[PDB]
Amino acid sequence: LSVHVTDLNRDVTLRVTGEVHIGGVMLKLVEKLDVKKDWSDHALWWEKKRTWLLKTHWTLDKCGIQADAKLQFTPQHKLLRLQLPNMKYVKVKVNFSDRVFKAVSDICKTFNIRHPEELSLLKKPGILAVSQPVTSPEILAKMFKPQALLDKAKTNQGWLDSSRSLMEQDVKENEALLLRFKYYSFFDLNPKYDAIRINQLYEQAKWALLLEEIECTEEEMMMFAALQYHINKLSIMTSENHLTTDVNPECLVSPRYLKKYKSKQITARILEAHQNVAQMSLIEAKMRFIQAWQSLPEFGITHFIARFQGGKREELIGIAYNRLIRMDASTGDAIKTWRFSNMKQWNVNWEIKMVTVEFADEVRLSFICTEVDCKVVHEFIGGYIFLSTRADEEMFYKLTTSTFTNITYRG
Amino acid sequence: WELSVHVTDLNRDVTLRVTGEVHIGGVMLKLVEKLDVKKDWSDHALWWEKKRTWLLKTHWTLDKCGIQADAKLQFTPQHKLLRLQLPNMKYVKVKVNFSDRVFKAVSDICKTFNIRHPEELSLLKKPEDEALELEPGILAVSQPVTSPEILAKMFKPQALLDKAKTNQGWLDSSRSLMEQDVKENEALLLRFKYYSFFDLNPKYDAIRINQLYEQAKWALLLEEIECTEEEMMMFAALQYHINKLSIMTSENHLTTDVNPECLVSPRYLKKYKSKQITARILEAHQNVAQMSLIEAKMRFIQAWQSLPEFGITHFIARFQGGKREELIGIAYNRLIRMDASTGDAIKTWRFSNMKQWNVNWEIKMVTVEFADEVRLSFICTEVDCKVVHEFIGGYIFLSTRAKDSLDEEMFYKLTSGWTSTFTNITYRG
């Protein structure tokens, strides 16, 4: 066995039986390496078979490791540059051996974000809560992409397999991944807990509109623009520690408090309370932005390249929280819509790379995508269904030629 | 015999020769004919202050009305001027029908002021500054007082017995303003009477919510309702916030260090110049702050509603097993027996468990019949009997409001006066 230690950049030849446990190989090297530093988080990785040799109690015979096979001994945790929904990069350390879903779950608790199942990873300290507009229009124009439907549909091929690890999906250390809200069904947006969660969701929406990733009318746009201007004003209040109006604070309390406190003591306790008032007004203002965003006709759709039965042209399959949509690749016009509530079950033919959905009233849908898109779309369908049952991390992996049944089929 | 009839607006007395079989309309014609004036008589009606009733039924005879000889009648216009103090403590002059039932009068007043659900509001007699014309911004604009001195000068006794005295002034919704000793150009209080607000919708109730917020704000400022110091400073913060939000709705200029062009997609920088982008954004922002304003006032009301002493109307009453004058308290869902000194709740009954209730007008006693034959009986002052009765019937009628026209006839059924008996329409089980 040739074993490469990644961080020390050294290859080690090891004498192997075939009956010795994986933990044995680890034991054989630590004695052979004889180094005074911590090996606690290192694990064996087999890039030839793109699988972790995590089950340590098992033997080499069960794993089938041939002679002169190139194994790696690598730390599970690596550094990863994540771009938040606010388009700001943050450096964090994540487990490259954990399932992506669990990885995202841990990240959200770290970032203080509830319901991580709404978020995922996409291929290309007070910063988590503060939201500020750019300094100049040039910054926006410099970030501008074509944002055409085919450009977006291509990007959606990058959604990671939530049931696999980071290492199995061609992600090296210090590469850039996008942290994004993947499913557009937001459950319980509670201002009492989700100050950071709501802020990022608002930011994701704000950029999507600014960078024309989603379309809206001029009236809608000016409305969204006004909200940002409003939200910035509210933000200033949360930091303001002074009277900034022409109103006497003593006019806002009952006269019995004029006897108990001096004028400065009233101005103080009101401003303290006002900061808490504006803090919730801030969150609720961002809530309205999101609500308007949610009500847009083109909201909540994820596009994938697909050809439908009897089709002569390139088209788009679109997945929303409540429906699947056949779309024109140029205009985005809805050709036909099937609703998820009317879905009994669905089929995935991995050979032909075809998805088939069965609905009530014997309605049947069939289309064909890229093979990568098949796993992505499969996870999207099962995910949106799994999210509809919120009132269980294991069930998410259950729902993500295979056949799966909609648990919420009525009739 | 002879009828002496005074025409109020013309300041003239007229002696009329009457049979006693002559119709009410006959008196009116004889009056118009003897006066010999080229005047509009459309809104005049006969009024009898001795018997304190309107003679509106024109087809009746003087005998059916029971009009004695030499009785002093008045011929007066039905619509008169009335000074109303809004919940924002500002007075407004409006013209209302003094012959209509108060319930309809309030309804007419509220649609004039653009306030939905008038059945929640009514008119209250004063237990200084009573003159101002009808303007649109007196109804919608909310501004804090100019000095702490204003609060101390408007301060009234807020003890429970003071409240019970004030609540003696609630008008009979089934009678008219004239029948209840209300002269023209007098001051009445327009207030939210019942504390069960159905569908407070910011899309329509910009004025309704504002006035309701004002009533709550003043009740707290004038210490008519109690709250903790944390709560008080919170309400104080809210006002400071609401004033700031209000200022924004009029501001038509940039007052931040942020460039407005950073708030739109780059496609609009080519279509518009910087000035019109700053303009159209400010135009939309005013409506944004306008909705923030309403939502802030809504939160104020919600906090107000959540206060432990909220939504209770107090009346002086003597109970059966009582050694003392005590207080009966009426909330939207319950009746409460209270100690007049401490304000402690002795016992509470639910409206849901109420089958029916009786009113002995002679003894001035109200008796409520509940499930499990538990029975409550008390006695109030003369005036309070009809008043307390109207509060009970009203709150029940308000419980029948569903998301589905207001059965005005039903309201008078549950709050009718002159031993009568009334049945809970919302009795569960």
UniProtKB/Swiss-Prot annotation, chain A:
Gene deletion effect: Complete embryonic lethality at peri-implantation stage, due to severe detachment of the endoderm and epiblast from the basement membrane. Heterozygous mice lacking one copy of Fermt2 show no visible phenotype, but show decreased tumor angiogenesis upon transplantation of tumor cells, and their blood vessels are abnormally leaky.
Keyword field: Cell adhesion, Cell junction, Cell membrane, Cell projection, Cell shape, Cytoplasm, Cytoskeleton, Lipid-binding, Membrane, Nucleus, Phosphoprotein, Wnt signaling pathway
Cellular location(s): Cytoplasm; Cytoplasm, Cell cortex; Cytoplasm, Cytoskeleton; Cytoplasm, Cytoskeleton, Stress fiber
PROSITE patterns named in the record: PH_DOMAIN
InterPro entries linked to this entry: Band_41_domain, FERM_2, FERM_central, Kindlin/fermitin, Kindlin_2_N, PH-like_dom_sf, PH_domain, PH_Kindlin/fermitin
GO CC terms: adherens junction; cell cortex; cell surface; cytoplasm; cytoplasmic side of plasma membrane; cytosol; focal adhesion; I band
Membrane association type: Peripheral membrane protein
CDD domains in the record: FERM_B-lobe, FERM_F0_KIND2, FERM_F1_KIND2, PH_fermitin
GO biological process: adherens junction maintenance; cell-matrix adhesion; focal adhesion assembly; integrin activation; integrin-mediated signaling pathway; limb development; negative regulation of fat cell differentiation; negative regulation of vascular permeability
Molecular functions (GO terms): actin filament binding; phosphatidylinositol-3,4,5-trisphosphate binding; protein serine/threonine kinase activator activity; protein serine/threonine kinase binding; SMAD binding; type I transforming growth factor beta receptor binding
Region entry Interaction with membranes containing phosphatidylinositol phosphate, spans: 21-62
Keyword Iron-sulfur appears in the UniProt entry: no
Superkingdom to which the source organism belongs: Eukaryota
Tissue specificity comment: Detected in adult heart muscle (at protein level). Detected in heart, skeletal muscle and testis.
Function: Scaffolding protein that enhances integrin activation mediated by TLN1 and/or TLN2, but activates integrins only weakly by itself. Binds to membranes enriched in phosphoinositides. Enhances integrin-mediated cell adhesion onto the extracellular matrix and cell spreading; this requires both its ability to interact with integrins and with phospholipid membranes. Required for the assembly of focal adhesions. Participates in the connection between extracellular matrix adhesion sites and the actin cytoskeleton and also in the orchestration of actin assembly and cell shape modulation.
Domain remark in the UniProt entry: The FERM domain is not correctly detected by PROSITE or Pfam techniques because it contains the insertion of a PH domain.
Protein family per UniProt: Belongs to the kindlin family.
Subunit (UniProt): Interacts with ITGB1; the interaction is inhibited in presence of ITGB1BP1. Interacts with FBLIM1. Interacts with active, unphosphorylated CTNNB1. Identified in a complex with CTNNB1 and TCF7L2/TCF4. Interacts with ILK, ITGB1 and ITGB3.
Stated name of the protein: Fermitin family homolog 2
Native species: Mus musculus
